[PDB]
Amino acid sequence: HFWNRSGTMGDQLPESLYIKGTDIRANPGSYLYSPSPSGSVVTSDSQLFNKPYWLHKAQGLNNGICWHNQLFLTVVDTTRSTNLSVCASTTSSIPNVYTP
Amino acid sequence: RGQPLGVGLSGHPLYNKLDDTENSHVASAVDTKDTRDNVSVDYKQTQLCI
Amino acid sequence: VAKVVSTDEYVTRTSIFYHAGSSRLLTVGHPYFKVPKGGNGRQDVPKVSAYQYRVFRVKLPDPNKFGLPDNTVYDPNSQRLVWACVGVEIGRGQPLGVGLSGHPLYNKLDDTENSHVASAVDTKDTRDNVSVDYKQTQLCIIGCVPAIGEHWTKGTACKPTTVVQGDCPPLELINTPIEDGDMVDTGYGAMDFKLLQDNKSEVPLDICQSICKYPDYLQMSADAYGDSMFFCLRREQVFARHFWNRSGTMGDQLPESLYIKGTDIRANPGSYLYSPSPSGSVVTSDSQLFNKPYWLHKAQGLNNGICWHNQLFLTVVDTTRSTNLSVCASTTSSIPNVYTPTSFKEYARHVEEFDLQFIFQLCKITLTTEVMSYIHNMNTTILEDWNFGVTPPPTASLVDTYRFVQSAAVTCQKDTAPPVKQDPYDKLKFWPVDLKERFSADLDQFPLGRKFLLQL
Amino acid sequence: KVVSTDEYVTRTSIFYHAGSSRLLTVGHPYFKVPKGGNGRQDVPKVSAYQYRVFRVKLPDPNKFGLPDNTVYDPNSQRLVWACVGVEIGRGQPLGVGLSGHPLYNKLDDTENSHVASAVDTKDTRDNVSVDYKQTQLCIIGCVPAIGEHWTKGTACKPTTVVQGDCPPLELINTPIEDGDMVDTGYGAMDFKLLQDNKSEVPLDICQSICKYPDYLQMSADAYGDSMFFCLRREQVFARHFWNRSGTMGDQLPESLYIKGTDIRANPGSYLYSPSPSGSVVTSDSQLFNKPYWLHKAQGLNNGICWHNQLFLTVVDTTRSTNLSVCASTTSSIPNVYTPTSFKEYARHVEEFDLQFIFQLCKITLTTEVMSYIHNMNTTILEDWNFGVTPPPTASLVDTYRFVQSAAVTCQKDTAPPVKQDPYDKLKFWPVDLKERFSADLDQFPLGRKFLLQL
């Protein structure tokens, strides 16, 4: 989704750009245009892994050799993405009329 | 990798929204400094490894 | 006959193989214009907003005259020397990214898509602030020479007479060489927008004062000897986001004959100018072309991939990265506790990063006569630039030269006069690319190279 | 039975390239507007919603370059073209655009159906803009082609005919011509039958009529002629639903539902109507710019321009814009915006680039075959060589002189034929290409490809 964010321009408007209008359009307004990004959709396909990696050959000159017996594994995943909500009643009793 | 899959949001209460410059529907506004809108949001799907 | 010679029909191909590759290119500026700060060196914030055709004038060194000649491999004297790149992996910068462009005084009659209410006031200047994207697109063009785009204009009212203020001209289509930073057409105007709209009240501001082209691949495919562009790669997608009808005078009129009239506004139907809003669609990384070897073999070009004058014209498009960035900078050195935007000056810039990477084969070409001379007739110039019988040149000029400057008041002709052969594309802007050291044979040591070797 | 043609059509080594340098034609979306003359000056109507039909003039090879009569005995043989290879080069970038209608009736929606007028009685109508299906077509033939289409049928018993009344219904087959309005999926029907309203649905088609091409017929093609190649591909969805206004001449039964009260006692509209729509495009899915040399057209015809006549068919849903010129009415623009200040205009563009590869066949002519052939049509024979296939003559009949008549036998007119196909009453993008015949082919991209494909 698109908005423009309100703000105050620290960067400026050529007029030489639009025909003016009146007032609110004699000078117009903002140019702070801002969208929302969004992931898209999931399905089971799309997990990149749980698949064997046989190495055959590293892209780099070292072919994956464990100096200092120290290994560095990098990973990123959206798929699971979530947090859990605890609704704890503030009441020990649970009112049988709700109140937030 | 464990778990099922799942997704979610992050938000912002004090958002500086100008306006929807999208369908800009119904219509557009003018000003205030109480520009501090409550907003929730998502972003890009990603899996990466090195 | 004109009959294309076709590289290979005399280019002695070799065992020569080379690497080249560009470490990072980087630049930032604003989504529209240059915000000048009075100039000159530099003191301006330019534009940076890559929806412009990207031309790297890509320079390599003279293989002819590398230096030393046991010439064991070859007699330049017969077999003059030339590059051909074979394999390329351009390493592409950044995450992927995206953004928005708009126009506050973007007209509109109405959102005639499926408006909730269909009100239609008849007052002017209701042109509001709307922003949008474009067709998701990746293209590259590779060539020995630059490229041509084509685009329109309000063409000549070549009718004898002249006519009415605001009357529709006839519209004439124009070919032009594409140049670095040339603005892309995006979905809307291989033409002169700026000309086209007397109003300046429409489209996204960025193109208001614009002209673009669309690349002339087809003519460029129709290339004289399969040169110019000898390689080209292209990928584009889109859909329509939302519908309007524009506001504006119909400069023509609707036939009645389309309807049973109604009453009033229905007796008299309103505008017929229906106008959508674009969008490129979702991105997955998957569809990014970039970052793989494009080994080339045969190609369309009947120059199979060579550059005299060491220039390859690397021409490119990517929609996967669009944003100029927002700084909310306080006007106050205080950070107030009640936030007002007003306590903030807010700023916009986009930034761009790059690597070209290569695997070449230099090839050597033995001078053949009713063919070399044909090449002269292809173009002599190179050939001059490989020269031969009698340069000719001129001693008195040659001696003279560099003397002056070590001062600026003493002698103050201060380089009024030049000396070039001249590249006409001097008048054109490139991203100036040279690589005369990215030169390597360390294929092994070259990402692409490794692949390449592997590619063997 | 008809036969595969090479059978009598002698194959060769002949290869040619020929290819169109540019096709271009431009004008206003929905209509043409006279701009005086009106030989010629006008605003043509141009929309890419016009059917692309090429009448292609091609070398009578029997008079052509490299006639080296290794080629034939010209007597016993005729020369005949086949183009063998085709690449339709498509102009412009891709694009699109929309249409609309102010007097687009609209009763309503169906979900934001939380209120209904429900009469209006007048006309409802609002301004509307619109989209339609993704579609890519090719059809190649040496004969122009026919589409299929609709008409309100007619009161076979003119009995009980009622004023602007529902009618019995007819399907019509007709030849398609160049520039002929394309069908997005409707106009194989008359509008000017359809809506007695003539103001309902989109303007653009409002006063139109189309047909849709029949492959089936054209695979009921007698020899593979107007179709020796055919390709069609469409994807589509419905964008939005509605109900249009309309005094239903149809009747909905009561029985079907409970009456409630009021509005919910009475019935409402059943004129469910929804949006057409294409969706997302990409070049990935592009049909054109593809090289056929074709191994075999499913036609018995091995793709021959009879009489050096070729018929090229195409459809492309990927550019759709006529462009809006904002020209100020003011000497120079003012500073405040007013629409007045600008006269705005709509114009469309189409370019095409054809590249081709031919192989001629030489024909040893043999009697029966010729005869055969003559039975295909004769104009054929008439092309070169002339035997009196017309005779007989007769089998014998009738008395006929009298025709000085007079009041003594008021007989027959009788009308003559004009020939000249019919095509001549009809339109193409006229295409002479006997100039583009290229004997090197490599200077044709496709030629190389083709060459390569060998």
PDB file of N, CA and C in Angstrom, chain A residues 18-65:
ATOM      1  N   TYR A  18       4.935  21.974 -12.709  1.00  0.00           N
ATOM      2  CA  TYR A  18       3.532  21.830 -12.871  1.00  0.00           C
ATOM      3  C   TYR A  18       3.073  23.153 -13.234  1.00  0.00           C
ATOM      4  N   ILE A  19       1.898  23.204 -13.848  1.00  0.00           N
ATOM      5  CA  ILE A  19       1.192  24.447 -13.905  1.00  0.00           C
ATOM      6  C   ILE A  19       0.615  24.571 -12.573  1.00  0.00           C
ATOM      7  N   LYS A  20       0.558  25.756 -12.074  1.00  0.00           N
ATOM      8  CA  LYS A  20       0.047  26.041 -10.803  1.00  0.00           C
ATOM      9  C   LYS A  20      -1.395  25.829 -10.818  1.00  0.00           C
ATOM     10  N   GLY A  21      -1.951  25.900  -9.661  1.00  0.00           N
ATOM     11  CA  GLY A  21      -3.350  25.830  -9.529  1.00  0.00           C
ATOM     12  C   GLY A  21      -3.658  26.998  -8.730  1.00  0.00           C
ATOM     13  N   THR A  22      -4.650  26.841  -7.896  1.00  0.00           N
ATOM     14  CA  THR A  22      -4.993  27.850  -6.956  1.00  0.00           C
ATOM     15  C   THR A  22      -4.608  27.378  -5.639  1.00  0.00           C
ATOM     16  N   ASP A  23      -4.297  28.301  -4.742  1.00  0.00           N
ATOM     17  CA  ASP A  23      -4.025  28.039  -3.363  1.00  0.00           C
ATOM     18  C   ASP A  23      -3.234  26.816  -3.073  1.00  0.00           C
ATOM     19  N   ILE A  24      -3.955  25.825  -2.598  1.00  0.00           N
ATOM     20  CA  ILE A  24      -3.501  24.539  -2.239  1.00  0.00           C
ATOM     21  C   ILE A  24      -2.854  23.825  -3.328  1.00  0.00           C
ATOM     22  N   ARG A  25      -2.977  24.368  -4.529  1.00  0.00           N
ATOM     23  CA  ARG A  25      -2.463  23.910  -5.758  1.00  0.00           C
ATOM     24  C   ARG A  25      -1.710  25.004  -6.422  1.00  0.00           C
ATOM     25  N   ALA A  26      -1.872  26.258  -5.988  1.00  0.00           N
ATOM     26  CA  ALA A  26      -1.050  27.336  -6.459  1.00  0.00           C
ATOM     27  C   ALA A  26       0.329  27.008  -6.050  1.00  0.00           C
ATOM     28  N   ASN A  27       0.436  26.580  -4.793  1.00  0.00           N
ATOM     29  CA  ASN A  27       1.491  25.698  -4.437  1.00  0.00           C
ATOM     30  C   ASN A  27       0.730  24.489  -4.096  1.00  0.00           C
ATOM     31  N   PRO A  28       1.238  23.363  -4.446  1.00  0.00           N
ATOM     32  CA  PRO A  28       0.624  22.134  -4.072  1.00  0.00           C
ATOM     33  C   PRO A  28       1.077  21.783  -2.676  1.00  0.00           C
ATOM     34  N   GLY A  29       1.655  20.593  -2.508  1.00  0.00           N
ATOM     35  CA  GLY A  29       2.068  20.051  -1.246  1.00  0.00           C
ATOM     36  C   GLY A  29       3.139  19.032  -1.482  1.00  0.00           C
ATOM     37  N   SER A  30       3.162  18.009  -0.615  1.00  0.00           N
ATOM     38  CA  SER A  30       4.114  16.912  -0.514  1.00  0.00           C
ATOM     39  C   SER A  30       4.561  16.173  -1.746  1.00  0.00           C
ATOM     40  N   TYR A  31       5.649  15.437  -1.566  1.00  0.00           N
ATOM     41  CA  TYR A  31       6.238  14.581  -2.542  1.00  0.00           C
ATOM     42  C   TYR A  31       6.920  13.477  -1.826  1.00  0.00           C
ATOM     43  N   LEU A  32       6.624  13.345  -0.546  1.00  0.00           N
ATOM     44  CA  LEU A  32       7.131  12.326   0.312  1.00  0.00           C
ATOM     45  C   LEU A  32       6.429  11.028   0.131  1.00  0.00           C
ATOM     46  N   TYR A  33       6.619  10.383  -0.987  1.00  0.00           N
ATOM     47  CA  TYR A  33       5.793   9.261  -1.318  1.00  0.00           C
ATOM     48  C   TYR A  33       6.359   7.975  -0.820  1.00  0.00           C
ATOM     49  N   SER A  34       5.534   7.258  -0.088  1.00  0.00           N
ATOM     50  CA  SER A  34       5.924   6.087   0.636  1.00  0.00           C
ATOM     51  C   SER A  34       4.993   4.868   0.535  1.00  0.00           C
ATOM     52  N   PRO A  35       5.436   3.771  -0.009  1.00  0.00           N
ATOM     53  CA  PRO A  35       4.695   2.519  -0.041  1.00  0.00           C
ATOM     54  C   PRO A  35       4.981   1.577   1.118  1.00  0.00           C
ATOM     55  N   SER A  36       4.127   0.584   1.351  1.00  0.00           N
ATOM     56  CA  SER A  36       4.397  -0.571   2.149  1.00  0.00           C
ATOM     57  C   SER A  36       4.841  -1.765   1.368  1.00  0.00           C
ATOM     58  N   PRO A  37       5.874  -2.437   1.703  1.00  0.00           N
ATOM     59  CA  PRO A  37       6.298  -3.657   1.078  1.00  0.00           C
ATOM     60  C   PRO A  37       5.492  -4.759   1.654  1.00  0.00           C
ATOM     61  N   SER A  38       5.668  -5.949   1.116  1.00  0.00           N
ATOM     62  CA  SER A  38       4.955  -7.077   1.584  1.00  0.00           C
ATOM     63  C   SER A  38       5.559  -8.329   1.001  1.00  0.00           C
ATOM     64  N   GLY A  39       5.683  -9.373   1.816  1.00  0.00           N
ATOM     65  CA  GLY A  39       6.283 -10.629   1.434  1.00  0.00           C
ATOM     66  C   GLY A  39       5.825 -11.282   0.195  1.00  0.00           C
ATOM     67  N   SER A  40       4.529 -11.623   0.178  1.00  0.00           N
ATOM     68  CA  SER A  40       3.788 -12.429  -0.785  1.00  0.00           C
ATOM     69  C   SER A  40       3.209 -13.700  -0.137  1.00  0.00           C
ATOM     70  N   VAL A  41       3.276 -14.901  -0.732  1.00  0.00           N
ATOM     71  CA  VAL A  41       2.542 -16.058  -0.238  1.00  0.00           C
ATOM     72  C   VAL A  41       3.379 -17.238  -0.007  1.00  0.00           C
ATOM     73  N   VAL A  42       2.930 -18.100   0.865  1.00  0.00           N
ATOM     74  CA  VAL A  42       3.643 -19.269   1.172  1.00  0.00           C
ATOM     75  C   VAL A  42       2.961 -20.484   0.706  1.00  0.00           C
ATOM     76  N   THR A  43       3.790 -21.459   0.444  1.00  0.00           N
ATOM     77  CA  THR A  43       3.354 -22.779   0.225  1.00  0.00           C
ATOM     78  C   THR A  43       4.530 -23.565   0.634  1.00  0.00           C
ATOM     79  N   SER A  44       4.375 -24.858   0.660  1.00  0.00           N
ATOM     80  CA  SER A  44       5.336 -25.800   1.089  1.00  0.00           C
ATOM     81  C   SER A  44       6.420 -25.927   0.136  1.00  0.00           C
ATOM     82  N   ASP A  45       6.320 -25.354  -1.014  1.00  0.00           N
ATOM     83  CA  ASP A  45       7.384 -25.553  -1.915  1.00  0.00           C
ATOM     84  C   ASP A  45       8.735 -25.085  -1.456  1.00  0.00           C
ATOM     85  N   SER A  46       8.546 -23.942  -0.918  1.00  0.00           N
ATOM     86  CA  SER A  46       9.503 -22.948  -1.117  1.00  0.00           C
ATOM     87  C   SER A  46      10.548 -22.872  -0.108  1.00  0.00           C
ATOM     88  N   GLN A  47      10.561 -23.818   0.804  1.00  0.00           N
ATOM     89  CA  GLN A  47      11.646 -23.937   1.709  1.00  0.00           C
ATOM     90  C   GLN A  47      12.895 -24.332   1.015  1.00  0.00           C
ATOM     91  N   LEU A  48      13.940 -23.529   1.137  1.00  0.00           N
ATOM     92  CA  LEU A  48      15.105 -23.860   0.425  1.00  0.00           C
ATOM     93  C   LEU A  48      15.821 -25.025   0.854  1.00  0.00           C
ATOM     94  N   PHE A  49      15.495 -25.653   1.975  1.00  0.00           N
ATOM     95  CA  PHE A  49      16.354 -26.704   2.455  1.00  0.00           C
ATOM     96  C   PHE A  49      15.683 -27.837   3.147  1.00  0.00           C
ATOM     97  N   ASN A  50      16.492 -28.606   3.892  1.00  0.00           N
ATOM     98  CA  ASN A  50      16.203 -29.898   4.428  1.00  0.00           C
ATOM     99  C   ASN A  50      16.454 -30.792   3.283  1.00  0.00           C
ATOM    100  N   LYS A  51      17.665 -30.697   2.785  1.00  0.00           N
ATOM    101  CA  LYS A  51      18.054 -31.262   1.556  1.00  0.00           C
ATOM    102  C   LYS A  51      19.489 -31.504   1.782  1.00  0.00           C
ATOM    103  N   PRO A  52      20.099 -32.472   1.226  1.00  0.00           N
ATOM    104  CA  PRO A  52      21.451 -32.740   1.517  1.00  0.00           C
ATOM    105  C   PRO A  52      22.287 -31.816   0.808  1.00  0.00           C
ATOM    106  N   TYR A  53      23.356 -31.500   1.450  1.00  0.00           N
ATOM    107  CA  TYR A  53      24.297 -30.781   0.737  1.00  0.00           C
ATOM    108  C   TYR A  53      25.406 -31.624   0.743  1.00  0.00           C
ATOM    109  N   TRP A  54      25.633 -32.108  -0.437  1.00  0.00           N
ATOM    110  CA  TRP A  54      26.874 -32.667  -0.670  1.00  0.00           C
ATOM    111  C   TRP A  54      27.609 -31.484  -1.137  1.00  0.00           C
ATOM    112  N   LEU A  55      28.821 -31.329  -0.697  1.00  0.00           N
ATOM    113  CA  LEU A  55      29.599 -30.300  -1.254  1.00  0.00           C
ATOM    114  C   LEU A  55      30.176 -30.942  -2.443  1.00  0.00           C
ATOM    115  N   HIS A  56      30.413 -30.245  -3.526  1.00  0.00           N
ATOM    116  CA  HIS A  56      31.266 -30.869  -4.488  1.00  0.00           C
ATOM    117  C   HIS A  56      32.390 -30.035  -4.629  1.00  0.00           C
ATOM    118  N   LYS A  57      32.172 -28.755  -4.560  1.00  0.00           N
ATOM    119  CA  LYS A  57      33.269 -27.914  -4.686  1.00  0.00           C
ATOM    120  C   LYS A  57      32.804 -26.574  -4.326  1.00  0.00           C
ATOM    121  N   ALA A  58      33.479 -25.959  -3.379  1.00  0.00           N
ATOM    122  CA  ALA A  58      33.219 -24.619  -2.932  1.00  0.00           C
ATOM    123  C   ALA A  58      33.425 -23.644  -4.024  1.00  0.00           C
ATOM    124  N   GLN A  59      32.685 -22.546  -4.056  1.00  0.00           N
ATOM    125  CA  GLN A  59      32.980 -21.516  -5.004  1.00  0.00           C
ATOM    126  C   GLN A  59      34.373 -20.955  -4.827  1.00  0.00           C
ATOM    127  N   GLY A  60      34.865 -20.879  -3.594  1.00  0.00           N
ATOM    128  CA  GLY A  60      36.182 -20.355  -3.297  1.00  0.00           C
ATOM    129  C   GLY A  60      37.302 -21.319  -3.173  1.00  0.00           C
ATOM    130  N   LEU A  61      38.502 -20.778  -3.163  1.00  0.00           N
ATOM    131  CA  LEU A  61      39.712 -21.544  -3.241  1.00  0.00           C
ATOM    132  C   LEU A  61      39.919 -22.521  -2.164  1.00  0.00           C
ATOM    133  N   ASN A  62      39.565 -22.122  -0.953  1.00  0.00           N
ATOM    134  CA  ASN A  62      39.456 -23.112   0.057  1.00  0.00           C
ATOM    135  C   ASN A  62      38.219 -23.858  -0.246  1.00  0.00           C
ATOM    136  N   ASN A  63      38.326 -25.148  -0.176  1.00  0.00           N
ATOM    137  CA  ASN A  63      37.216 -25.957  -0.366  1.00  0.00           C
ATOM    138  C   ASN A  63      36.806 -26.419   0.972  1.00  0.00           C
ATOM    139  N   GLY A  64      36.270 -25.475   1.737  1.00  0.00           N
ATOM    140  CA  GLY A  64      35.613 -25.744   2.987  1.00  0.00           C
ATOM    141  C   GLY A  64      36.366 -26.484   4.016  1.00  0.00           C
ATOM    142  N   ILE A  65      37.495 -25.929   4.404  1.00  0.00           N
ATOM    143  CA  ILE A  65      38.336 -26.543   5.381  1.00  0.00           C
ATOM    144  C   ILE A  65      38.475 -25.753   6.654  1.00  0.00           C
TER     145      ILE A  65
END
